[PDB]
Amino acid sequence: KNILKIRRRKMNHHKYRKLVKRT
Amino acid sequence: HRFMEPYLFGSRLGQDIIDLEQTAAHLQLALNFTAHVAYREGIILFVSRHRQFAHLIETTARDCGEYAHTRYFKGGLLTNAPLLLGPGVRLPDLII
Amino acid sequence: KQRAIQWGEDGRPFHFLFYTGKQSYYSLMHDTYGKLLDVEKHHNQLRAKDLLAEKTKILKDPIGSR
Amino acid sequence: SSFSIYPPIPGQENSLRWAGKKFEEIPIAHIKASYNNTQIQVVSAAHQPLAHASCGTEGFRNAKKGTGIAAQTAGIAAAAKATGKGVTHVRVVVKGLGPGRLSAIKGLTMGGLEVISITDNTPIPHXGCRPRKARRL
Amino acid sequence: ANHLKFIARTVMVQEGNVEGAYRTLNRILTMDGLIEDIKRRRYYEKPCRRRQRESYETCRRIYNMEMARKINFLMRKNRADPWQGC
Amino acid sequence: SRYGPEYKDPQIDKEYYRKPLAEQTEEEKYERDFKKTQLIKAAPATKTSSVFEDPVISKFTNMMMKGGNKVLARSLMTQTLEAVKRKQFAKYHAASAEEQATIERNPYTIFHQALKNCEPVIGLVPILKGGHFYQVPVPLADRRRRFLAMKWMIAECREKKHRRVLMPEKLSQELLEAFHNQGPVIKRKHDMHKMAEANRALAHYRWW
Amino acid sequence: ATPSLRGRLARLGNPRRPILKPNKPLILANHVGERRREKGEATCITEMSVMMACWKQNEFRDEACRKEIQDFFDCASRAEAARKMRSIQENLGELGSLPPKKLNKLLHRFPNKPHV
RNA sequence: GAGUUAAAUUAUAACUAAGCUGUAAAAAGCCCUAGUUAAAAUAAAAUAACCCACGAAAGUGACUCUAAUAAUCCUGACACACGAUAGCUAGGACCCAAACUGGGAUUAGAUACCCCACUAUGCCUAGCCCUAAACCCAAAUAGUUACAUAACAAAACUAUUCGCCAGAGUACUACUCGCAACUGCCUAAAACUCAAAGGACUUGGCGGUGCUUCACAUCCACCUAGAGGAGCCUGUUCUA
Ligand SMILES: [K+]
Ligand SMILES: [K+]
Ligand SMILES: [K+]
Ligand SMILES: [Mg+2]
Ligand SMILES: [Mg+2]
Ligand SMILES: [Mg+2]
Ligand SMILES: [Mg+2]
Ligand SMILES: [Mg+2]
Ligand SMILES: [Mg+2]
Ligand SMILES: [Mg+2]
Ligand SMILES: [Mg+2]
Ligand SMILES: [Mg+2]
Ligand SMILES: [Mg+2]
Ligand SMILES: [Mg+2]
Ligand SMILES: [Mg+2]
Ligand SMILES: [Mg+2]
Ligand SMILES: [Mg+2]
Ligand SMILES: [Mg+2]
Ligand SMILES: [Mg+2]
Ligand SMILES: [Mg+2]
Ligand SMILES: [Mg+2]
Ligand SMILES: [Mg+2]
Ligand SMILES: [Mg+2]
Ligand SMILES: [Mg+2]
Ligand SMILES: [Mg+2]
Ligand SMILES: [Mg+2]
Ligand SMILES: [Mg+2]
Ligand SMILES: [Mg+2]
Ligand SMILES: [Mg+2]
Ligand SMILES: [Mg+2]
Ligand SMILES: [Mg+2]
Ligand SMILES: [Mg+2]
Ligand SMILES: [Mg+2]
Ligand SMILES: [Mg+2]
Ligand SMILES: [Mg+2]
Ligand SMILES: [Mg+2]
Ligand SMILES: [Mg+2]
C-alpha cells in the first residue's frame, strides 16, 4: 500500500527535524 | 427489459402491454419453422424451468412424441454431451 | 445390471426424458405425480357425485412396512 | 381503575394522599449512583437531612463498593435508619447512571421503606464543560 | 435548576411494585436517546469522530430499514409449496 | 463401553413391579419399555435387590477402597457401623429416664444424618480475569455437595489420625462428632462458608 | 420511512459535498446475519445476599437460616432449569420472526440483481 | 457588528455524614472533603438533525436586531484578496479540558498505554505566521448514453482552455530569489547507489481480529493413581 511511502517520508522529515535541533 | 422496448405497444398504468401484431408475425414464423424441422425428422426438446406448468409441458411432449426437460438443468448437458449422456449422442436440432 | 441402449440406429432416443440426464428417475416422478392428479381428479368427481368409497390403507404397522 | 403516570401537579388539587399527607409533603430519597460508588440520602419535605448511607460507610472498600450488592446493602441500611425517625413513604430521585441504580431502588423496598414515585435527574449538559479525553485502554 | 421539580422524567408506581415502574422509565429514556447520550458524554469525542459516527449510524439505519421492508414484502411467500415434486 | 446407545439402566426395585395397578401413567412407562424392544444392560455386581442395602452406603464403601480390595472396604464399613452401634448401646444403658429416649441406636440413621450436616451450602471456583484469579462463590449442585461431604470424611480420618488407632474406630468417632454438629468436618464446612461470605462482592464475575 | 439516499454519496455528477462515506457498498446481500447469543449475568444474587445476612448474624450456623437456605437452593434449581432449556427452544420459537436459516432460503428465491 | 441565556459546572453559604475520588485490580491524591438546598462570572452550544441548506475555499447549525451574499448569467497567472488547527508579539479572561513537568501503578527497563495534580494553551480585542490525508486524492465551462468492461474504486466519453507530469533512492534535502518568516515558508538540483521502485489482483499461511458452534481423558471447571524428594536398577549429557 501507499503507506510504504508515507513512512519513508515520515522518517526523513523526523530525522531532519533532529538535525536542525542539534545544530 | 431494455431489449423488449420495440416489442411493447405501450404501458397502461405502469403495466406494459405487448403488441400482438408483432407477436402474430413472429408466432407465424415460429410455428412454420417448428413444423419444418419436425417434417425433416428432427429432435425437438421442450425446456421450461417453471414450477407451475412442469407436468403440463411434460405431458405435452409425450403426446407429440418429442422430448421435454422441465427439471433441473445440469451444467455440462448440451456442451459436454458425451460424458453426461453417452459415447455417441445425437444433439437436438431445435429447442423450445 | 446394465443400462440398455437408449437410441436407435438413427440416434433418436427411445424415451421422452432422455435429455434430462436421469430418464428412469424422472419418468417415475412424472408417473407418480400423474397418479396424484388422477386421484385428485377422481376424488373431485367423487365429491361432486357425493360418494366416498375409498379408505386410507397406509397404516401397515402389523405387517411392518418400511 | 384509571391510573396516571404523570405526577400530581401542585397547582391542581388531587385527592391522592399517602399516610394522611399530600404529595409534596412526602420526604425525598436522593440516590447518586456513580461508576465507583453509590450514595443514598433521605431528606424531608423541607430539605432537612434525616439519614445518610453509602457503600463506603457500610464496610465495602475500593472496587468492592462499586458492585450492585454494595448498593443493595446501603439501601437496606439507609431505610432502617430512616424508618427509625418515622417515615413510611418517600419519593426517590436517581442521580446519574451507574451499576447501583437498580440495587438502591430495591434496597429501600426491602429495608422497610415504601417508594411511590421515581425521578431521574442525571446531569445532562446542553452543549457545558468539556469532559475528559478518551481512554486508549 | 430554575424549572419546577418532580415533573420531568418522573413516573409513579401503581399497586405497590417498583421493578415495573423503573423499566417504564428506562424505555422513556432509551426512546428519547438520553441513555446513549449519557454514555457518550462520559468521555469527549473529537468532532472528527462525531461525523464518522453519524455516517455509520445513518448507513446502518438505511440498510436495516431496507432489508426489513424486503423481509415483510417477501413474508407472504412462505406458505407450503403447492407444486412440490412437480 | 461395550454397551451400545440402545442399552439402558435396569430397574432393580422389586416393589416397582409388584404394585403397578394403582397408577396409570407409570404403567404406560414400563409397558412401552419392552414394547419398544429396548435392550437392557446386565445387572451390576454391587447393586442388588436386597432390602438391607442403601445407595449412600455403597458410594461411601467404594471411596474407602484402595486398589481393588472390595472385601477389605466392605469389612471396614461393616466394623464402622458395628463400632458406632456398640458406642450408642453403651451410652443408652448409662442414661436417665428422660435421656434414654433421646439416643439413637440406628447406625444407618446416624450415617445418613451425619453426611447431611457436613455438606457445604455454597462452594468456590476460581475465575481468571485481568490476569488474576478471584475466588467466586457458586451454587454447587446437590450431587457435588453430597460427594464433597464424603471426601472430607475420608480425608480427615486418613491423615490426622494416630498410627495406633484403627480405621473403623476412628471413623466411628467422627460420625458421632458430626452427628452433634461439633466435628472437625463441620468446622471445615464453616471455614468454606467463611471464605465464601468474605468474597460476597465477587459473585458478579461469574456468567451463569 | 427509509432515509433519503439522494445527493449523499460521493459521485461525479453530485454538486453537494458527500454526507455519507460507507465502509462497504450499500448492496443488499442474499443472506441475513445470524442471531447473537445473549450474554449471561450472575444469577441468584438477591437470594444469596439475604442468606449471607443470616450466616453473619448466627455465627455461620444454618440452625435458624433454613428458610434462607432453601430459597437459595430453589433459586439454583430455577436458574439451572431455565439455563439448560433456553438454547433448544429459542432456535425454533422465532418470536414471530423466521429463523435465519429460513430467511436465507427465502432470499435466495428472490435474489437481488446488482448486475445487468 | 450589537444585545441576550436555557441545561451543566465552580467561587461561596447553610445542614447532615466520615470518609471522598480512582481502576481489570490498586496505590497516590484529598479529608479546606462528600451529599442536599440557595447561586454570579468564564466557557461551550442536548433533542430538533432518519433534515442536507448557505459561502469562492478553509468553514457555519442557542436566541434577537442591524448591515448583507460580485457579474444580462465563458477560460485565465508568479498579480490583488482570503485561508481550519498548531505557533509568535502585547493587553484582558480562566468554569473546564490539557502537550510539558511531578507523584502512583505496570514492566527486565516504561523518561509509554492506565490513575491524580497543575502550566502553556484552547477564549475576547489588535497584529503576525500562510502550513494540512487544505482529499470528494476525481480542475473550469458546455454537453452525449453513442462507441465500449485492464484491474480496483465513485460507469464510459467529446469540444474549448489553463495548470501539472519524463525510472527509484538521495530529496517536503544542499545552494539561490522573495517573505513582519530567523529551529521558518516558498522555489528546488547534482555527485553517488541500484535494475529496479510502484498500482491492482489470485491462491496459501497466519492473526493476543469479530460472530456462531464444539473439546466425553478434555483446554477450563472438575475425578483417581503417580513423577520431581531417598536408596537401588538402567539410559543419556558432562568428566575420564
Ligand atoms: K445549546
Ligand atoms: K484465503
Ligand atoms: K524416577
Ligand atoms: Mg530516507
Ligand atoms: Mg444557570
Ligand atoms: Mg455549493
Ligand atoms: Mg474504504
Ligand atoms: Mg472567579
Ligand atoms: Mg492511601
Ligand atoms: Mg462541596
Ligand atoms: Mg452536514
Ligand atoms: Mg463562484
Ligand atoms: Mg452569488
Ligand atoms: Mg475570469
Ligand atoms: Mg491561519
Ligand atoms: Mg489558533
Ligand atoms: Mg493560538
Ligand atoms: Mg520569535
Ligand atoms: Mg498572550
Ligand atoms: Mg490556564
Ligand atoms: Mg483541571
Ligand atoms: Mg512518572
Ligand atoms: Mg476539509
Ligand atoms: Mg491535491
Ligand atoms: Mg480541487
Ligand atoms: Mg482553473
Ligand atoms: Mg463561475
Ligand atoms: Mg460539468
Ligand atoms: Mg511516459
Ligand atoms: Mg532522478
Ligand atoms: Mg512541509
Ligand atoms: Mg526546506
Ligand atoms: Mg542552485
Ligand atoms: Mg491428560
Ligand atoms: Mg509406586
Ligand atoms: Mg527420584
Ligand atoms: Mg541415574
UniProtKB/TrEMBL annotation, chain A:
Residues annotated for Mg(2+) binding in this entry: 12
UniProt source species: Sus scrofa (Pig)
UniProt similarity note: Belongs to the mitochondrion-specific ribosomal protein mS38 family.
Listed name of the protein: Small ribosomal subunit protein mS38
Localization (cell): Mitochondrion
Domain Ribosomal protein mS38 C-terminal: 1-23
TrEMBL record, chain B:
Residues spanning the membrane: none
Domain of life, per lineage: Eukaryota
Compartments, as annotated in UniProt: Mitochondrion
Family: Belongs to the universal ribosomal protein uS2 family.
Function: Required for mitoribosome formation and stability, and mitochondrial translation.
Name of this protein: Small ribosomal subunit protein uS2m
Gene that this sequence comes from: MRPS2
Automatic annotation (TrEMBL), chain D:
The keyword Ribosomal protein is annotated on this UniProt entry: yes
GO cellular component entries: mitochondrial inner membrane; mitochondrial small ribosomal subunit
Family statement: Belongs to the universal ribosomal protein uS11 family.
GO terms for biological process, alphabetical: translation
One term of GO molecular function: structural constituent of ribosome
Chief place where the protein resides: mitochondrion
Statement: the UniProt record of this protein carries the keyword Nucleotide-binding: no
Keywords: Mitochondrion, Ribonucleoprotein, Ribosomal protein, Transit peptide
Organism: Sus scrofa
Residues of the full protein shown: 60 to 196 of 196
Compartments it resides in: Mitochondrion
Protein name (database record): Small ribosomal subunit protein uS11m
Automatic annotation (TrEMBL), chain E:
GO molecular function, one term: structural constituent of ribosome
Cellular component GO terms, alphabetical: ribonucleoprotein complex; ribosome
Keyword Ribosomal protein in record: yes
Modified residues (N-acetylalanine): 1
Stored InterPro entries: Ribosomal_bS21, Ribosomal_bS21_sf
Gene: MRPS21
Alphabetically ordered keywords of this record: Ribonucleoprotein, Ribosomal protein
The species this protein was found in: Sus scrofa
Signal peptide: none
Name listed for the protein in its UniProt record: 28S ribosomal protein S21, mitochondrial
Family: Belongs to the bacterial ribosomal protein bS21 family.
GO terms under biological process: translation
